Amino acid sequence: ASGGGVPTDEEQATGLEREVMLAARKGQDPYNILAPKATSGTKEDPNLVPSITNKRIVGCICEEDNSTVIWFWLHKGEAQRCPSCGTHYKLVPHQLAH
Amino acid sequence: HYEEGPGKNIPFSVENKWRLLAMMTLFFGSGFAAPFFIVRHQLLKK
Amino acid sequence: ASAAKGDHGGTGARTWRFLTFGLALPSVALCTLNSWLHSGHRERPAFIPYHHLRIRTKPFSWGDGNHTFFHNPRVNPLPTGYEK
Amino acid sequence: HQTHAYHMVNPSPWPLTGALSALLMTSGLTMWFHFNSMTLLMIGLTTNMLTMYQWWRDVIRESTFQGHHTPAVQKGLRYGMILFIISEVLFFTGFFWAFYHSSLAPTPELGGCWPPTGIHPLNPLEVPLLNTSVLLASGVSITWAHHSLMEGDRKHMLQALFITITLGVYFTLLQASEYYEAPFTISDGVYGSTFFVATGFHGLHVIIGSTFLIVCFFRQLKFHFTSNHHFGFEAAAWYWHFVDVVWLFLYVSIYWWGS
Amino acid sequence: ITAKPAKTPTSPKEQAIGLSVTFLSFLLPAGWVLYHLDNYKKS
Amino acid sequence: FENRVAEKQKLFQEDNGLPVHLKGGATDNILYRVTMTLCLGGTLYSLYCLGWASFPHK
Amino acid sequence: MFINRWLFSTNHKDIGTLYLLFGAWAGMVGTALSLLIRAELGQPGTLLGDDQIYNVVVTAHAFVMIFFMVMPIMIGGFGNWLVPLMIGAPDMAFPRMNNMSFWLLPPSFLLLLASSMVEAGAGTGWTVYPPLAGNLAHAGASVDLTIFSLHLAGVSSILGAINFITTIINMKPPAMSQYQTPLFVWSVMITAVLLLLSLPVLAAGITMLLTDRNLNTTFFDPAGGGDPILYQHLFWFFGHPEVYILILPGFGMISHIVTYYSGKKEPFGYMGMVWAMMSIGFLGFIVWAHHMFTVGMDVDTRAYFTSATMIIAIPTGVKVFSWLATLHGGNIKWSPAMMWALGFIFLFTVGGLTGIVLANSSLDIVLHDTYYVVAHFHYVLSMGAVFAIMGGFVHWFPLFSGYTLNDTWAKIHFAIMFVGVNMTFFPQHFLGLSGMPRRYSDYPDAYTMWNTISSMGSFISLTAVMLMVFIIWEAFASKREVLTVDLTTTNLEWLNGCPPPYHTFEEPTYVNLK
Amino acid sequence: KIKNYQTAPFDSRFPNQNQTRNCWQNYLDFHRCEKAMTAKGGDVSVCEWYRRVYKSLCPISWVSTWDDRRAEGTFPGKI
Amino acid sequence: MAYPMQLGFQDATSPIMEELLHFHDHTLMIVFLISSLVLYIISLMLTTKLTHTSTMDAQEVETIWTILPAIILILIALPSLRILYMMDEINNPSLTVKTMGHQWYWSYEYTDYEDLSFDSYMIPTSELKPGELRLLEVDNRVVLPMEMTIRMLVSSEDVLHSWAVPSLGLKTDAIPGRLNQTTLMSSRPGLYYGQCSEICGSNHSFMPIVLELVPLKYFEKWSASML
Ligand SMILES: CCCCCCCCCCCCCCCCCC(=O)OCC(COC(=O)CCCCCCCCCCCCCCCCC)OC(=O)CCCCCCCCCCCCCCCCC
Ligand SMILES: CCCCCCCCCCCCCCCCCC(=O)OCC(COC(=O)CCCCCCCCCCCCCCCCC)OC(=O)CCCCCCCCCCCCCCCCC
Ligand code: HEA
Ligand code: HEA
Ligand SMILES: CCCCC/C=C\C/C=C/C/C=C/C/C=C\CCCC(=O)O[C@H](COC(=O)CCCCCCCCCCCCCCCCC)COP(=O)(O)OCCN
Ligand SMILES: CCCCCC/C=C\CCCCCCCCCC(=O)O[C@H](COC(=O)CCCCCCCCCCCCCCC)COP(=O)(O)OC[C@@H](O)CO
Ligand SMILES: CCCCCC/C=C\CCCCCCCCCC(=O)O[C@H](COC(=O)CCCCCCCCCCCCCCC)COP(=O)(O)OC[C@@H](O)CO
Ligand SMILES: CCCCCC/C=C\CCCCCCCCCC(=O)O[C@H](COC(=O)CCCCCCCCCCCCCCC)COP(=O)(O)OC[C@@H](O)CO
Ligand SMILES: CCCCCC/C=C\CCCCCCCCCC(=O)O[C@H](COC(=O)CCCCCCCCCCCCCCC)COP(=O)(O)OC[C@@H](O)CO
Ligand SMILES: CCCCCCCCCCO[C@@H]1O[C@H](CO)[C@@H](O[C@H]2O[C@H](CO)[C@@H](O)[C@H](O)[C@H]2O)[C@H](O)[C@H]1O
Ligand SMILES: CCCCCCCCCCO[C@@H]1O[C@H](CO)[C@@H](O[C@H]2O[C@H](CO)[C@@H](O)[C@H](O)[C@H]2O)[C@H](O)[C@H]1O
Ligand SMILES: CCCCCCCCCCO[C@@H]1O[C@H](CO)[C@@H](O[C@H]2O[C@H](CO)[C@@H](O)[C@H](O)[C@H]2O)[C@H](O)[C@H]1O
Ligand SMILES: C[C@H](CCC(=O)O)[C@H]1CC[C@H]2[C@@H]3[C@H](O)C[C@@H]4C[C@H](O)CC[C@]4(C)[C@H]3C[C@H](O)[C@]12C
Ligand code: CUA
Ligand SMILES: [Cu+2]
Ligand SMILES: [Mg+2]
Ligand code: NA
Ligand SMILES: [O-]
Ligand SMILES: [Zn+2]
Structure with a gap:
């Protein structure tokens, strides 16, 4: 038998490792470990881009297997379009503060 | 925190262009002079 | 192979402790006996000052410059031969 | 506040102290080989040991104590350790190349034969075979230690890891004794050169790997490792298997085929 | 690329000084050694 | 032995602005100062040794 | 704060800056050494002394240009600054180990300077072949100091290599495949794999040289059954990969510069460019004995190394043709950077083709250890590697500094350099075909004209170097602050401004999977 | 045939640029032949060809070093 | 020996050295052609106001770019290896x-x-x-x-x-x-x-x-x- 005596992550993980472990349990991704899935990206159904400030860099892979990524600052306000494919992105600011 | 922006993200000052000229002179000039002074050193031994 | 037992699908740790105590340490215990049997001091061979052996191109940086780091007087001749 | 999982490291003096350690050790070897003095070298070795101690202490502080080792940081350390081991494989490869070059085309100065005239190789069935059994046994015990850790078994992890360390120490003492008893030396031409430098570098790596395992032993005593998070133990196991495989290549190449 | 006008303009005269001092920092030490090679030879 | 990791986690997460290499207390500062003194003094000695080895003697 | 920032750095940008500063200083040492070479050769007779002082200068020249100028600028400097910015990463994987890679170099350089000041120096060639490099023909500390210099530089680049490979594999946005990373990032990754595999074999060889010199081993000493030629195999197993290490990050920068100043969103044939760099990296490991065609190797070995060497032309040509196809249809901006890149494409091609001449073991009997080889490698290094560096530097100076260069001054600098390097090296082909040996302080009288012209070329190059320092001073003296940069949609490194903040990508980019 | 001897002919055992082993083998063959003939009272003259071939191919300092080591009892090849 | 202002190889004294001069002339013609074609194409790419900045398909041209250099290498390798095995032949x-x-x-x-x-x-x-x-x-x-x-x-x-x-x-x-x-x-x-x-x-x-x-x-x- 195991007489035990080894801590688990549940008991002893701390700091950012613990925050990543507990968010994953609730299916949340505050530390951007997963690729977000696209919407249809129309003006009616824009890609929703979380940020902790009023702007965030978007990279748009316009078509699957494009080697060229298209990069642009997405500002709080009206949806913006990728300058190459026109896909719509909208910033959704929050804070992580708690 | 650390200084940001042009002239501040470097380990040398660019606050005064004449002091900067002196520093760059000593920096690049020391590099270029060193082989001449090692040739001298070796000729002056034997 | 020269192996032949059969996959022991128990606890991982349990199986590897089984191999540690049942195969690995017994092999070490056996090789330890084979070595504390064949380990009697053997007769040192006649010294021949072969020029491809006892190389000295620079003195060693310890001792008198002429003794190797793990010099064994019984079996390691100097370039001029055995000590006594 | 970052919203990625990666580790921004506090500004550290240990890269500079490590770089200067390398200057003192190299200029020290130079002073030892040419100017009959060990003083620079001893300072270098001392600052090197202090650098490694404080650097790896801080990595334990960052991980066990501060929680900076997210799965993403851990996956990076996995790559780093694999790439490090690959660079060590290629290092050993140069010594194997030297051995095969010298031994497959023995020159007239040797007698045009391998082993050279005047060389009496060790019996590969004596201490070299014991050394093989010792490092192979240590690969079994460390696998036991690994499985005990993952299964949450403190006492069997500690027993298996202790046994692994003990076999490492035993190999080290057997090899020191073989060095003392060997009737050939490093100055015995290309036979002594290839034998002592290849097995000598292997021996240093056994001492390094044994040291890494002892660090894991004391970290385990102090409950640092969880049943799921123990990269230092995994890195030390990979390094230990590396040391075992290099031994098997040395045993087959130098002790057996080159005898 | 677009940029602001210079914060601390460097006049033609100031450029002549920077260029002159830069070239002399390379030329004078090497010049000195090379001029005295013959003197170094005897020693 | 007993698991005292939670105590160490509390010490090394204390909001005191110290870098990790000094956050253990006064002993860190001492070991730092000894390491840097040996490195900087050793480096000065290595430069002296160069100067000495750069000129003939006997 | 100064010490914490600049001695205790864990920041990819500052460490990049330290690398560029180190490489610039090293460049000046290398340049001075090159001028001492061409002063010795600039008229028939003896200027400095016999071949010992001369070959100490030649040996140092090579080590400084390769280990202290090119690799630190390209990999340490551009690599650290650009690679994390181009993949949206907040820093390197091992930011503290990164700082040790940097701080190993000043001590490495100190050991090489000590080498040259002790005894009569290491007059070995940068190849350090025994027995000339052994303890009877090179008694004393010099060669051991050289070996230790190389051990420090080796450890630096191996740790830097682990850092880059790990960073590039592990720290991209989760949607970004390796087939969505920029060509410069590919060039650094492939370069790092070559360093990881080649430098340990160099370390093994030079360690065996050290033991032969100091512990009475005989790996390279026939008296003990050793072989000088074994050293050559171990050295060149590293030394051919080393020349691909020196150019690959240049190929990465040229891909970015040609794309940028062609006004294109992307290089022509991305996947062909990735394929070509991997193929070159692989082929660079199986060709090393083209450095050994005169040692006495069997004819079938010579036939194999001839054929395997030439094949490298195919992936290299795909890159050259793909650069031309990138220009094709561009709105060309004739920037200083673009002029460096266009000079690169042509002069690298000439240098590559003289390499192909040398690949032919039968001609190489006559061209080996002559100035034809010297012409080949200065075309690819002093024109290829250096032009990619100057192009990179001019292009990215405003990103690193936040200040603009004077473009007119930059174009003047290019024109002077272009004249000097061509006048220096082109006539070295004639010296090689007509049989002037390498590593000579003096030459038979017939070789005078081409040596004279070559030496005059080198003084023109000196004028360009001195002017470069002034141009850098003028930019920092004037402080024209950058406002707007074109094509940020396809050059992510520019999107955080100039210079970027100390911390970038604290919040990572958003990139979705469609 | 030793009347007509110009130099050592091509030997398909040593077809390549490195001839070290050619010189060594003919040196060994000559001294083995010669040992065997004087030990069976017979005539050394039959060993002559190996003598001519090693003299042609072997550097004088190699022959002279090997001759010294045979007299010293430190020659490493089997004769 | 070499004479003042020499550009090329010393006149051949041996049939092997003659073979090398002819093989060099052949290789040098290919070197001059490739280097001058690259310089010409650079000038052609840079001497038009006409533009085409959209994505370019690479498949067709990469065939040309690999097969033509492959053939050229074969045209160098053939005489190169003839001379190599000629130098090694039993005399x-x-x-x-x-x-x-x-x-x-x-x-x-x-x-x-x-x-x-x-x-x-x-x-x-x-x-x-x-x-x-x-x-x-x-x-x-x-x-x-x-x-x-x-x-x-x-x-x-x-x-x-x-x-x-x-x-x-x-x-x-x-x-x-x-x-x-x-x-x-x-x-x-x-x-x-x-x-x-x-x-x-x-x-x-x-x-x-x-x-x-x-x-x-x-x-x-x-x-x-x-x-
Ligand atoms: C507060 C306590 C401080 C005490 C300790 C430190 C003293 C600090 C002073 C006082 C501190 C208070 C604040 C003062 C700010 C700076 C003062 C100044 O203008 O003083 C100048 C400073 C800084 O020194 C340098 O930076 C050296 C270069 C000098 C300027 C050249 C400019 C080059 C521009 C062109 C390059 C383009 C590429 C960049 C383009 C990228 C742009 C972003 O001096 C030093 O104190 C040098 C200390 C070393 C730090 C690391 C430098 C890296 C070494 C480079 C490798 C050399 C290879 C030799 C190899 C060795 C072989 C033997
Ligand atoms: C600034 C540099 C310094 C200037 C030096 C210029 C040279 C002027 C000298 C007096 C000139 C008189 C004759 C002109 C021929 C000169 C060049 C040449 O044909 O070279 C001659 C050969 C050897 O050939 C010979 O065997 C001699 C051939 C002569 C035949 C013509 C009739 C005979 C009269 C010539 C006198 C000798 C005859 C007796 C000899 C008989 C046989 C040996 O040398 C080589 O192999 C050099 C290999 C270099 C490889 C580089 C590849 C090309 C890169 C540039 C291409 C694009 C252009 C932009 C170019 C951009 C730059 C890269
Ligand atoms: C950046 C550094 C660098 C690079 C990239 C290269 C690239 C090449 N080198 Fe070079 N080389 C050196 C640096 C470099 N070399 C150094 C420093 C030495 C000397 C070492 C010493 O002794 O100190 C040397 C030595 C050297 C030798 C030894 C000569 C001797 O000592 O006798 C040989 C022999 O084969 C060789 C060949 C080549 C070849 C075939 C390439 C190829 O990679 C070139 C391929 C490129 C092209 C061909 C041009 C572009 C292609 C096209 C436009 C397609 C069409 C072309 C054809 C069909 C041919 N080199
Ligand atoms: C990168 C490698 C490199 C570079 C750039 C050079 C550049 C030069 N080299 Fe050298 N050279 C070698 C590597 C290189 N060399 C090697 C490996 C050997 C063989 C060594 C041996 O035989 O053992 C050699 C050999 C060699 C010889 C033969 C010696 C002999 O056989 O006796 C000669 C002779 O003319 C020569 C001359 C020159 C000259 C005049 C330059 C000039 O073109 C230099 C001009 C100046 C520069 C190109 C500027 C450099 C500075 C920067 C680029 C930094 C600034 C950057 C920023 C601010 C970011 N070199
Ligand atoms: C089980 C082993 C125990 C631990 C080792 C013990 C002592 C120090 C050894 C260090 C390990 C290094 C290995 C390679 C160096 C040299 C050979 C060492 C192997 C050894 O210890 O061999 C001994 C020789 O030691 C000698 O010369 C003396 C050697 C001491 C001098 C130091 C050598 C300095 C070499 C510098 C290494 C630089 C490489 C760095 C690579 C960095 C990567 C870039 C053998 O003894 P012997 O009397 O000849 O023969 C036996 C006869 N009874
Ligand atoms: C492109 C390469 C592909 C093929 C690789 C194959 C490898 C090994 C082949 C060896 C087989 C030959 C063995 C029997 C015959 C004797 C060989 C021999 O003799 O080879 C000798 C030594 O080779 C030696 O050590 C050889 C030493 C090996 C050098 C190979 C380098 C690779 C090292 C890196 C590999 C990393 C892998 C990581 C490990 C997991 C050299 O030749 P000589 O005798 O000096 O000849 C001289 C003349 O007299 C001839 O007339
Ligand atoms: C003559 C003098 C020579 C030198 C003498 C001896 C030198 C070295 C002694 C052996 C090395 C000891 C290394 C100790 C490392 C301890 C830190 C550690 O292991 O750190 C771990 C990360 O791994 C990491 O950095 C992994 C770090 C990997 C370290 C690699 C070790 C190899 C070094 C060998 C040196 C090369 C010399 C080669 C000679 C040619 C921490 O993460 P975890 O373990 O997941 O903990 C977290 C959990 O608690 C959370 O719940
Ligand atoms: C033998 C030697 C031969 C001499 C050759 C001289 C070499 C170089 C000539 C330099 C001429 C610069 C080229 C054109 C202008 C660029 C740089 C410049 O001198 O100043 C320009 C404007 O002057 C402004 O207003 C700023 C006003 C401040 C004036 C200070 C500058 C002095 C003028 C330059 C003359 C230098 C001569 C010195 C000779 C030693 C700045 O750059 P822009 O024009 O804004 O272009 C970039 C834009 O896209 C940015 O938005
Ligand atoms: C003849 C004498 C020559 C002397 C030259 C010696 C040079 C220097 C001596 C000083 C070195 C000792 C100091 C310890 C260094 C430990 C490095 C390490 O362990 O680095 C780790 C990365 O490399 C990894 O994992 C894995 C990589 C582990 C590398 C360990 C150190 C190896 C040093 C020698 C290298 C030999 C190369 C192999 C072939 C010869 C950790 O990365 P950091 O960025 O710190 O932290 C990141 C944080 O997230 C951690 O919480
Ligand atoms: C050099 C000396 C030899 C040392 C060899 C070291 C090999 C290290 C590879 C580890 O591979 C092992 O394969 C075992 C297969 O035997 C498995 O064990 C266990 O896994 C199962 C469940 O986890 C148990 O039920 C099984 O009984 C048990 O074998 C286990 O996946 C794994 O560790
Ligand atoms: C490799 C690139 C470097 C080569 C090109 C450098 C050209 C250098 C410019 C001249 O440098 C100076 O030349 C003076 C002579 O013109 C020297 O003075 C010397 O000559 C004068 C007149 O003979 C005396 O007044 C001085 O005292 C005496 O030191 C002086 O020392 C030296 O600094
Ligand atoms: C901050 C700490 C870092 C700085 C430490 C600086 C220490 C400087 C100590 C003095 O230096 C030398 O050390 C060696 C000590 O053993 C001696 O070598 C000696 O080597 C041989 C004896 O082993 C003698 O024959 C030689 O004469 C002799 O120089 C030498 O004399 C002695 O002066
Ligand atoms: C003290 C501790 C029990 C309490 C706890 O787990 O902290 C036990 C568990 C495992 C033990 C160790 C293991 O049994 C392995 C070793 C066995 C040797 O006989 C003594 C030392 C040895 C290294 C032991 C020391 C000590 O008794 C340990 C460390
Ligand atoms: Cu003898 Cu060069
Ligand atoms: Cu090569
Ligand atoms: Mg040669
Ligand atoms: Na001269
Ligand atoms: O090359
Ligand atoms: Zn898009």
């Missing part, structure tokens, strides 16, 4: 001569019949006879019969050297403990010069090679006179 030498490298002079041994050896040193500049060549003349030349297959064996008694004669297409490294073989055949009498071609220390630049190629009967009497 029957009439004579064997050894050269040993030293710091800093060559020694020669002609030991097919008699014990003939000598040292060959550079003539110092202050001792040249009028019209003699600075750094090239030796005291004792390497006298050899013309129009005959000679086996040269090269080694060293110290560090690496390399024994070269450009007009005969010869360069053979001199390695201590090793005996390298090359074959020499001069179509012509004369004086054929070369220089040490592996860095070997203080006087690397100052240990040249002079072959003196003469009719067999002059070679035979010279040999007898040198005993």
